[PDB]
DNA sequence: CGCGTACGTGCGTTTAAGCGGTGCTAGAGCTGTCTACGACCAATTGAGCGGCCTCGGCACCGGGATGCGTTTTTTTTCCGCGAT
């Protein structure tokens, strides 16, 4: 009875991939642990700066 | 190279940094405890990849328009000399 999958991006209201960003943080040798809001925050900042250059 | 004065020098006056010290207490830093949060795992599936087709944006062309650099002949300007 498994719930339909909503991407973490859609929950954060982002177009940039939260889930990918989390996975690059975890595998990029930055810290032993990555908190749940970190990729959400970082994807958001990457999205903002992308928008601003694109505008 | 020649002209004007901005900076270096020195000296006499004035300022406040440095020093050694005491006193007070904010907050750095440490300890132990509890628990929210992240890692890990296994199953499940949809986001995003590689591959493939299409047709309009863009590169490239020639032609014509126009912006502008250059020179020579033309009108205005700013002097510039003394002689007053
Ligand atoms: Ca944004
Ligand atoms: Ca914007
Ligand atoms: Ca593609
Ligand atoms: Ca082409
Ligand atoms: Ca041409
Ligand atoms: Cl976090
Ligand atoms: K202290
Ligand atoms: K905690």
Curated annotation (Swiss-Prot):
Disulphide-bridged cysteine pairs: none
Q: How is it modified after translation?
A: It is involved in the initiation of both imprinted and random X inactivation. Ubiquitinated H2A is enriched in inactive X chromosome chromatin. Ubiquitination of H2A functions downstream of methylation of 'Lys-27' of histone H3 (H3K27me). H2AK119Ub by RNF2/RING2 can also be induced by ultraviolet and may be involved in DNA repair. It is present at 35S ribosomal DNA locus and impairs binding of the FACT complex.
Q: Which GO terms describe its molecular function?
A: DNA binding; protein heterodimerization activity; structural constituent of chromatin
Q: What GO CC annotations are associated with the protein?
A: CENP-A containing nucleosome; extracellular exosome; nucleosome; nucleus
Write the gene name.
H2AC4
> Where do transmembrane segments lie in this chain?
none
Please indicate which part of the intact protein appears here, giving the first and last residue numbers and the full length. Answer: 11 to 65 of 130
Q: What is this protein called?
A: Histone H2A type 1-B/E
The organism's taxonomic lineage, starting at the top: Eukaryota, Metazoa, Chordata, Craniata, Vertebrata
N6-(2-hydroxyisobutyryl)lysine modification, residue list? 27
């Amino acid at each position: 009875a498994r719930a339909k999958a909503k991407t973490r991006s859609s929950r954060a209201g982002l177009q940039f991939p939260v889930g990918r960003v989390h996975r690059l943080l975890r595998k990029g040798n930055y810290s032993e642990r990555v908190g749940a809001g970190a990729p959400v925050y970082l994807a958001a900042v990457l999205e903002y700066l992308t928008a601003e250059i694109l505008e």
